[PDB]
Amino acid sequence: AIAHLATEYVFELAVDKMVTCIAVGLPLLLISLAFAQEISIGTQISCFSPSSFSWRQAAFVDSYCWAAVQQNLPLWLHKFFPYILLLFAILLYLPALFWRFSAAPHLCSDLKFIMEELDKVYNRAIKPIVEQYLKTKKNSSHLIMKYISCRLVTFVVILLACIYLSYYFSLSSLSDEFLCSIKSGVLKNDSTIPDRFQCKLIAVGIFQLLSLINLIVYALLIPVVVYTFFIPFRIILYNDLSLYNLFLEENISELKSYKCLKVLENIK
Amino acid sequence: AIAHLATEYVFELAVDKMVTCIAVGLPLLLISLAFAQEISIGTQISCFSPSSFSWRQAAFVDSYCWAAVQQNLPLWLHKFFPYILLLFAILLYLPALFWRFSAAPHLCSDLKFIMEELDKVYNRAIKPIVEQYLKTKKNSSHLIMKYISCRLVTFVVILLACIYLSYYFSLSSLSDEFLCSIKSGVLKNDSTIPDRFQCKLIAVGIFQLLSLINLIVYALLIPVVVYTFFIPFRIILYNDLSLYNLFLEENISELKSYKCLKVLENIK
Amino acid sequence: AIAHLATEYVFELAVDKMVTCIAVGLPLLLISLAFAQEISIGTQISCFSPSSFSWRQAAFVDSYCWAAVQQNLPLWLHKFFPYILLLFAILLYLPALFWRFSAAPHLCSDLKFIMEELDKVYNRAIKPIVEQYLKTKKNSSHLIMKYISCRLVTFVVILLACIYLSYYFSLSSLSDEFLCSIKSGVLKNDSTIPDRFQCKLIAVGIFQLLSLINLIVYALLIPVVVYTFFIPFRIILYNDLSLYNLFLEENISELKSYKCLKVLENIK
Amino acid sequence: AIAHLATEYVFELAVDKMVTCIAVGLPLLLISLAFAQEISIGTQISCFSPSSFSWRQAAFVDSYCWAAVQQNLPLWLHKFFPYILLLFAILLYLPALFWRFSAAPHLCSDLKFIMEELDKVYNRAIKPIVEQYLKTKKNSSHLIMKYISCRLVTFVVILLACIYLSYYFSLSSLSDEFLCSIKSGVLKNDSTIPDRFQCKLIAVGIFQLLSLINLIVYALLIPVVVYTFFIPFRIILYNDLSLYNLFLEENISELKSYKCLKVLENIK
Amino acid sequence: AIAHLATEYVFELAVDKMVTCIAVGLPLLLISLAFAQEISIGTQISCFSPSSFSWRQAAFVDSYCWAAVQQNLPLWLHKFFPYILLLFAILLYLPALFWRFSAAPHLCSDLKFIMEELDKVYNRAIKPIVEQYLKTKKNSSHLIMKYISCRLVTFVVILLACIYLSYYFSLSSLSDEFLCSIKSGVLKNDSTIPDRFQCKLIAVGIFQLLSLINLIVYALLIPVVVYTFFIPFRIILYNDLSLYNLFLEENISELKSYKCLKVLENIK
Amino acid sequence: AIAHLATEYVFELAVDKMVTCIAVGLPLLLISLAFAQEISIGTQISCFSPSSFSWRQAAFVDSYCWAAVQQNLPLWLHKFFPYILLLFAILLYLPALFWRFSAAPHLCSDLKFIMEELDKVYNRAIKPIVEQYLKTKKNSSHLIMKYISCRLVTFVVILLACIYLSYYFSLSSLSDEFLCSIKSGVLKNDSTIPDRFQCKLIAVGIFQLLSLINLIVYALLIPVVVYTFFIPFRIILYNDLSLYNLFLEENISELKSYKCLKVLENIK
Amino acid sequence: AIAHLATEYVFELAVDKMVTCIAVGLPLLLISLAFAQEISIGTQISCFSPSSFSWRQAAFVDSYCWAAVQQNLPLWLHKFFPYILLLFAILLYLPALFWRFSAAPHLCSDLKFIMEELDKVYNRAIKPIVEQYLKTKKNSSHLIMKYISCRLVTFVVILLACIYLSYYFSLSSLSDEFLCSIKSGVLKNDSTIPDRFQCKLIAVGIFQLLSLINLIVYALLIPVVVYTFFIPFRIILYNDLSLYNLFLEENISELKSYKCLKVLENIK
């Protein structure tokens, strides 16, 4: 099954796309691995039911204690751990989705305009409205704020994930087991039931290791996201213009005339 | 499995589409997470069958009490909780579906007409039927009512969801367990059966947490829907016109001449 | 899984299509929800097997009583309830399928003819066979009968569903449990078997609630279907014609000249 | 799951196609419903194993008696009931498949020839080889026999299904239970085993009801198939010709000139 | 599930294609029905484990005896019965696959050549290289041998299937049960184990019936395959030619000029 | 399920493609049949746990002995048998994959060149660079070595498979059962555990038969692969050329002029 | 199921693509085989629960010890072994993904430029900007570093995998079993529980063998990756140029003029 999942992953700036794809793809992959393993192991929790307890009496304790997790804080995390990772995946995904609707329409029209004007310059020279436009964008700060927000939000989500994972991972090794008391209501007075059942969370060992992998990847991912902020350090015939220029570099692949001019410039 | 579900979500105004997509996509996602977890845990309820009860005698109590939930109000909600979320997803979806059939055909023809007339103005000027038409739409209130209803219905459904979730979430912490009596009919006289079986709802802890996530998202979603109502606060050669204008802004991406004129206007 | 089902629903008159889509889509959705829940709960019925009975002896009673349901009337409905809903879905679907083959071919040719003639009038005026044809259709009652039958059949099926659901829902609350006797044939003389086993239908509580949802939707759907019958109350260069006119209104989206003429008419 | 199956059905003469589609689609649908329910109930048969029998000893009787069904006639039908319905579906399908290869190639070429000749007549008149051809087909009885056979075979299969279902349905109510003896071979001498185990077929109640639905539909379908035989009772510029004429009526949707001429004829 | 399988089947000479499609499709269908039923019944074999045996001790005998089938001949067939049918399906499929690569390339080029030459004759006459070619093919026996082999192989495989099924079916009724001894190795000396366990093959009753259906179909299929051998008994401006002529008849659907000439010939 | 698998198989030289397709498709098919049966039987191994052992104590022995297979040689093969077949499928597949990248690009360009030159000769004659090229290829041995290696590797893999299967098949009949000792570590001193558990491999009987089928097919496949080596024994206006000529024969289907010239040559 | 997986694999330099495809495809295939087998065997671990322990008491030890693996080093590897292979697959995949975004855009534009210039030379000669460009690339070392890094990273990952697998494989044979103590917390004082439970990892035998297969393949893969580093040893009318030349060789298939010139050169 794992190959079926991975083959999908094997068979806007590229760096930013990779960061987003990694930030969201990795936890989803990690979550899937846990469940693929969980379904293979069967149950997430097990309790020492007394030998006198029937299979459902034992099963009752297991399910009861699974719910009792909410009635000691780490225990709560263990039960909802996959959802927290899922939350991070979604939170890391919102910057790209928000970007797709808030910035992509503006950028698409603007780039095509610039590209067409550049080709007109190339064709005319062989045979500056766009420059005045671009110079105006140098005075604008509306689009750069849109980009800063996506990276800023992603960065903050990553920090929260790193801190969260560190707290989780460091405390995980000591919270695998807890004492659950099912003596509630009428059965609080039952003497045939032990005062507490020792229950162990089976997936904690997996989640604990998975958290470390995720922590390391995000730790490596932090400086990559930081590097996107150095925009100015990132072309003859901290301004929005710098952002357009960076996008121009990413779309140079589309500029047919630029390729020709680049060879001429290189020769010269 | 969760990645299989999420990858579908990862791989009319945009803001309104996002609101609708979030309002309906989130609960469906939440419902799926519960079942993905429920199938992994196995059963939704468990009862303290006496140790003398056989596996089906124990199983009988569990299934019996599951049905007995209807014969104390929160208990009823817990059993049908996924359906209530599903109900909200459908109810939040009707405004978009109703909009698709009641408004989209009118708007499609109207926008294309306006776009074509604008291009004719652009072409002719380089070389006002539409203005008289648009001015008439300023006197019309038929289409704006259609939009108001979709947002109004969605907004009301959200409020109901927020109130419902708040009632559910606040009471959830105290209703995880209930005492079920299977002593009905002939077996009401059976002395080998305890007067009541203490049964615990296993998914309540998950649903309770899921409700909080959903509550927070809808709480954040309310002002977003409210913001759509500020239409007037939302372009040389509270009227339906304001709505057409807003749709024109959303479709500026299609206006080729507008892009050119916008650069000229910016330069000027 | 529910998201997988719902996403298909999220990702001839429109009103009639919605009515048909709702009338058939809703019960299918409801049926699917029951089974999705049923598979999660495991079994539809459970019986108090004596503690002396082995797992298959207990299982035998459960399966036996499940069949015994036919040997008190509500009990019969509970077992076949999903099929009854499925029957309604199919019965509500036949009017659309019958319409597709009995009316759609006639209407398609007729509309395209009218549309082409209207465009010829528009083109010629700028530069009445169809009127004489349409006037003849005003004297015809062959096609309107086809439409009346589809709405009439759908309406009748809805009434039957509403009555059926009301009878089912009102009686459901009292028929969750029944006394089953497996003492048949040779085992009628077995003293180790109780005279009757108290068995409870587990899905009745779900079906009972689902019936109420379906009942409410159909109750709201009845007046919508009724509204289609007010055809006459439903455009310079109770007759079949009224039906063609109504279809013309639905296909105005296709009339390019009409859009232009409508703006001119509005201006005038 | 049922919605997944039904959505495929929701999302040569039309009447004959409907008859074939119904005759084959209905039993396949019915078969699928049984298995969808059977998989939800778990087992098709259950036997009163003595309380001294272990789970496999009980399981052995169930499986043994399931096979013993062949060693009283209705019992045999119950086990193979789905296959009998499947047999009917296939048998009802052969007339259409046989028709597709034996008649469709002849009819396709013949219709297109006629259609082209009719258009040539229309074009020439505005500006009789086909008539002599058609008149010859009036003297031919080769193609009508092909059609008669498909309807005849389908009709006969339906009658057999109706008789079969009636015999099955009427006897079903009395054959739900049978006495199975596993005392064969070496274990014929085992005194710890009862002389017979009372076993009950669990799916009989479902199949019995399903047979009634199928019986009613086929009973309604019989006169529809019969109506196809009244070919003669079924268009200025019992012969194969009557069959071609009937096919011409079905393909009038394709005749562009006929539509125009029909309006002129209607006006005249 | 059965509908899912059948819908694929519902939604080179045609007769030969049908024969091949039936010869291979039927057993595959039959095999699928067995497994669809087998998965619903659970296990293929069951043994009378003593009541003192634990669930795995009982399970051990069942699995042991399932393997012991090879250590009385019919028993062997029952275990591998699906594979034998699968073998027949593959063996019946090889003639078509072999035909696809050994004959189809030759025939495709030859037919198109003939068709083009016939059209050239038609066009020229209105305004004999191919005849000399065809006359040469009358002297050739290379291609007819290719066809004879495919039918011959298919025919022989059918006879073997018919004989095999007859032997299987006739003996099946007496070999449902066998006595299995697990007293091997160290446990040959165990006195707590009975000398033999009576085990019954659960699927034999199904396979036995399925074999009869398959036998009847192949029995009807034999004369159909035989009829293909009567090639000579099978068109003005036992030779390979007879085979080309037969293929010409199958491809007359493609000959546009032939259709026109056929009407003229019929009129004349 | 088997039909689902087979339908994919039912619905570079052709002989070599068939050999490769058979050599790889057959074992994959065989492997799938084993697992389809294995999943239907449930477990691959079973051990005589003492009647005093609990279900997990019995289950422990089964799983323990399954691993103990590695701590007598045939036993090892039985556990990994599917992987060995899978290994053969992959090993038989590498020659085709290697061929696809090492030879197919060269051959594609070369054939198209030859085909174009042949058409130029045909067109010019009606109205020798390629001959000098081909004559040079007669002096080259670079491409023939590429072909020889693919057949040689495939042939060797087949021989190894035949020898392996023969060793496996011949020894299989005697190694179905083995004595497993779980008395290791602390439990080596447990007197409640028998010194050895007699365990039987359940799938050996299936694998043993499957090996014979595979052995026979490969035995028939050996001479087919050998026949490919007789290249010289395999067309007016052991050299690489012989290989190109053989490929030309396979691509004659594409040569339009050759078809025409072949008829002329045949007539002459 | 295995055929379903394999058929996907059966139905930038080619050598490098094969290396990457093998390096990543093989472990994914291996991982899938383990899980396909694991799901067929059921559980990954089993412990000698005392015969007095109930099924959940036994199940508790199994699940407990599965988690206890983290509280002797090889034991840790066995639990996470599939993830380690998955880690290698991803790590081997990053060089190709990184290459796709960091090098593929540059190479695509550069090759097409060169190809177009070569065709211009061919056309002009029959009837040196690119040479000066290429000569400049000979002085550049920017792109070769990109390639070196992908091979270097892949190579290092392979070495780590080889060392890791060797350590794992060599130690695997001695770490199949471990002694697990569940006497923690309150149950540390329970005398009814043995001081340690002997637990055996069931999948170790499979993983151990799989590691050897993977080790051998990577061992063979190492020299293949090394061979890519010998770039200089790898065409009239250690420099980046050498890399472009190597890519030119891979894309010669696209050069139509080169093919013609190659034949002329060969003839000359």
Curated annotation (Swiss-Prot), chains A, B, C, D, E, F, G:
An annotated GO cellular component of this protein is:
endoplasmic reticulum membrane
* Complete-protein stretch covered: 2 to 354 of 426
What name has this protein been given in UniProt? Pannexin-1
Specify the glycosylation sites in chain numbering.
Answer: 189
Q: Main localization of the protein? A: membrane
Cysteine pairs forming cystine bridges in this chain are 47-199, 65-180
Q: How does it assemble?
A: Homoheptameric.
Keywords in alphabetical order: Calcium, Calcium channel, Calcium transport, Cell membrane, Disulfide bond, Endoplasmic reticulum, Glycoprotein, Ion channel, Ion transport, Membrane, Phosphoprotein, S-nitrosylation, Transmembrane, Transmembrane helix, Transport
Keyword match Secreted: no
Question: A single GO BP annotation from the record?
Answer: response to ischemia
What Gene Ontology molecular-function terms does this entry list?
actin binding; actin filament binding; ATP transmembrane transporter activity; calcium channel activity; gap junction channel activity; leak channel activity; monoatomic anion channel activity; protease binding
Q: In which tissues is it expressed?
A: Widely expressed, including in cartilage, skin, spleen and brain.
Its ancestry begins with: Eukaryota, Metazoa, Chordata, Craniata, Vertebrata
Q: Which organism is it from?
A: Mus musculus
Modification sites for S-nitrosocysteine: 21, 260
Domain of life the protein comes from: Eukaryota
